[PDB]
Design goal:
The structure is a homodimer. The first copy, chain A, is an alpha+beta fold and about 375 residues long. The first copy, chain A, folds into 2 domains: about 5-240, Heat Shock Protein 90, CATH 3.30.565.10; about 245-380, Ribosomal Protein S5, domain 2. Chain A has helices at about 5-15, 45-60, 100-105, 115-120, 140-150, 205-225, 245-255, 310-325, 360-365, 370-380; strands spanning about 5, 30-35, 35-40, 75-80, 85-90, 125, 150-160, 160-170, 175, 180, 185-195, 235, 240, 265-270, 280-285, 295-300, 300-305, 330-340, 345, 355, 365. In chain A, the strands form 4 sheets. In chain A, strands 4, 5, 7, 8, 9, 10, 11, 12 and 13 form a 9-stranded mixed β-sheet that branches. In chain A, strands 17-16-18-15-14-21 form a 6-stranded mixed β-sheet. A two-stranded antiparallel sheet of chain A has the order 2-3. In chain A, a hairpin with a 2-residue loop joins strand 16 and strand 17 (about 300-305). The longest helix of chain A has 21 residues, at about 205-225. Chain A is globular. The termini of chain A are far apart. In chain A, about 50% of the residues are buried. Chains A and B meet through strand 1, helix 1, helix 3, helix 4 and strand 6 of A and strand 1, helix 1, helix 3, helix 4 and strand 6 of B. The structure holds phosphoaminophosphonic acid-adenylate ester (2 copies) and magnesium ion (2 copies). Chains A, B: GO terms for molecular function: ATP binding; DNA binding; DNA topoisomerase type II (double strand cut, ATP-hydrolyzing) activity; metal ion binding.
Chain lengths: ~375, ~375
């Protein structure tokens, strides 16, 4: 009756890794539709499926970030979705094409670094992460979840001297030996076909499933375009995602509900390292048409739905609004994008970040001009 | 640079398993203080520490529940907290005192079932859980997290014929061989000393840390008292937790803010199995003094902060309120306690449950008398 599972079988059965493994109601689910307009998707979807995509996307946005290591130059992240096949490719240095001595002993066969990265659970370059490292990745798990939910997958990486191609098939059951050839290219690509039918979807995807998933991925790519460094262009199905600022994100999310609106902007800064290395970009819209407070937070490349950084903004605005009114956040839509050192995620899904609220009180300052303009707009509505 | 971790080392370093491993701001943190009054704890605390306690408590509440197995009779759950030492004991059948053949081969030594339960990750009786099983436990992880965050721990279990005592020390590094003796007792006890200092606390606990943690545990025990079956009494430091109904919970949470209030009650039922086996108990208070909607949900023994069961209640009330007003949830405090089959938790912490919203629409009915009285109270406030 007491059973012992391995990681691979556990991940196919257990919602704890990536969320539910069939379709459920995902409150707040959005996608982008073509001007770009973010719109709700009021149909049930599988959280673990969307997480396949997210794990690959955050791995790509992580790559340009140095954590006490040599700088890496990434000029593109290319995301593709067609005929059910999903791929994500970025340049910058490839995953090292070299034998991993420890994994080879554990496996009793030659195992190269990219196979460790994609096939070994609890394995990666962030196992001993510094508290100030602002990569989203931390557990050495996410890429393996993508593989375990794929009927077939191909990892291709090149390092400027060699290219490494490896098939990882049947939900990680069948790892084929890699093919290594000479090459002058340099990139990392993951291409896969999710187990759609096992996750509740039609085989092949229905028209509506395809449209919803494409819209979700496109919006995730647009979020990345605002987060990544100035040198990186994001593409979705070869089209550049032209949402490189928090203002552009705010406009896309409010185009239906409050077109031609004022966008209040702020760069929230800190004086002391490590916080001073990481300004937070903010854009907000205030409208009486908004039914409840909403934020979109892209923190360390992750779409965060809950965290004390939001509360810091809301409480600071509220204090001012109460004062000005006496002479409060339900009319606000706010976008917050940037890196925060020292946060801890509450699960592999990275839905919620955890931190002492006093980090923001001690270290960060919200510009008075933004607070004053937000307060004026909110009070006008209240009155 | 690419490192491979084992589960034990990963759990000591990674917030994904139990939450942050030092003190952070936990919005909504509450404890009970002595009449019983639930009050906020406005000090940062370590989520993983509180999760040690929760994992043991949910294991105890799970024990009486049959999932297509023989019925188990549990008459008590005794929780203790003194001098930093935490223990949880329940009766009912003990963990089997028998050699585990598979674990013994993996370990190359004699390993008994209770050592598998407490020391092997991804191991337990719920690995192949039926979708209709309403135990909180699912992953085969929680007890190991308790051990990995203990400087010392003792597992004691008895099966009516033998007693098994095993020391599990130094954050799972040092598993001592068990001592097995004849016995007529029958129970399962876990006693441990958390690694307080490593988790941010004083050694020994400060007066305030001790008071906060005791209050948190006591409130968690009171929540259990409303969830468990009629035959089980919950004790905290030997005192019975006299909060056996949702009404008693609602009163304790509103005693400071709205004493002597009306408590609206409902039992939400479904007609079809498996849902019809699991009525949901509800108690709500409506007051203009409440600043925002709040719920306390004990679902499958777990304190759930987010789930579509709440949304089902809010939307049903809102529809009525809009209609009656025209001739809405911020004045509500609501307690919901019961089992829901087919939910999936989003992480090991079980903060959020996932389900299709249509489960409630199709299967469950909220009594009209409760909806009507709630609506009258809410509309009176609006007007
Ligand atoms: N697109 C990529 N480009 C370059 N290196 C990559 C890429 N994707 C993954 N890697 C490497 O492969 C490792 C394993 O990835 P992954 O399993 O996602 O773990 P992680 O990103 O470190 N942590 P997490 O995603 O929180 O589980 C990473 O640590 C990187 O070193
Ligand atoms: N108090 C207890 N009384 C009896 N059996 C217990 C008790 N605690 C744990 N067990 C058994 O030990 C197993 C391992 O517990 P645990 O590691 O918490 O896993 P789980 O409860 O099945 N799943 P999860 O808590 O979601 O990780 C359980 O499946 C039970 O069979
Ligand atoms: Mg990753
Ligand atoms: Mg458990």
């Amino acid at each position: 009756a007491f059973e012992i599972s391995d990681f691979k079988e556990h991940a196919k059965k257990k919602s704890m890794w990536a969320g539910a493994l069939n379709k459920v109601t995902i409150s707040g689910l959005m996608g982008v539709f073509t001007d770009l307009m973010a719109l709700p998707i009021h149909r049930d979807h599988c959280p673990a499926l969307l997480k396949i995509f997210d794990e690959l996307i955050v791995n790509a946005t992580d790559h340009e970030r140095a954590c006490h290591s040599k700088t890496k130059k990434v000029t593109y992240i290319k995301i593709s979705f067609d005929k059910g096949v999903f791929s994500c490719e970025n340049d910058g240095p490839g995953i090292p094409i070299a034998k991993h001595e420890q994994a080879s002993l554990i496996a009793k066969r030659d195992v190269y670094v990219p196979e460790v990265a994609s096939c070994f659970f609890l394995a990666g370059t962030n196992i001993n992460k510094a508290k100030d490292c602002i990569k989203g990745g931390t557990n050495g798990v996410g890429l393996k979840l993508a593989m375990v939910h794929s009927q077939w997958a191909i990892l291709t990486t090149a390092d400027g001297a060699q290219k490494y191609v490896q098939q990882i098939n049947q939900r990680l059951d069948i790892i084929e030996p890699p093919t290594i050839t000479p090459s002058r290219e340099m990139f990392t690509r993951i291409e896969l076909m999710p187990v759609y039918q096992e996750l509740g979807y039609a085989e092949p995807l229905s028209e509506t499933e395809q449209a919803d998933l494409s819209a979700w991925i496109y919006l995730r790519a647009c979020q990345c375009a605002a987060y990544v460094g100035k040198g990186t262009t994001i593409y979705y199905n070869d089209k550049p995602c032209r949402t490189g600022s928090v203002m552009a994100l705010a406009k896309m999310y409010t185009l239906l509900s409050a077109p031609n609106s004022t966008i209040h902007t702020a760069t929230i800064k800190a004086d002391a390292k490590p916080y001073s290395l990481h300004p937070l970009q903010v854009a907000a819209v205030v409208s009486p048409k908004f039914k409840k407070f909403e934020h979109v937070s892209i923190i360390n490349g992750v779409n965060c739905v809950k965290g004390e950084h939001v509360t810091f903004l809301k409480k600071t605005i509220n204090e001012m609004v109460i004062k000005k009114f006496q002479q409060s956040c339900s009319n606000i839509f706010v976008v917050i994008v940037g890196s925060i050192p020292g946060i801890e995620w509450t699960g592999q899904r990275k839905d919620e970040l955890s931190i002492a609220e006093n980090v923001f009180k001690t270290h960060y300052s919200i510009p008075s001009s933004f607070l004053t303009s937000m307060t004026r707009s909110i009070v006008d509505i209240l009155l």
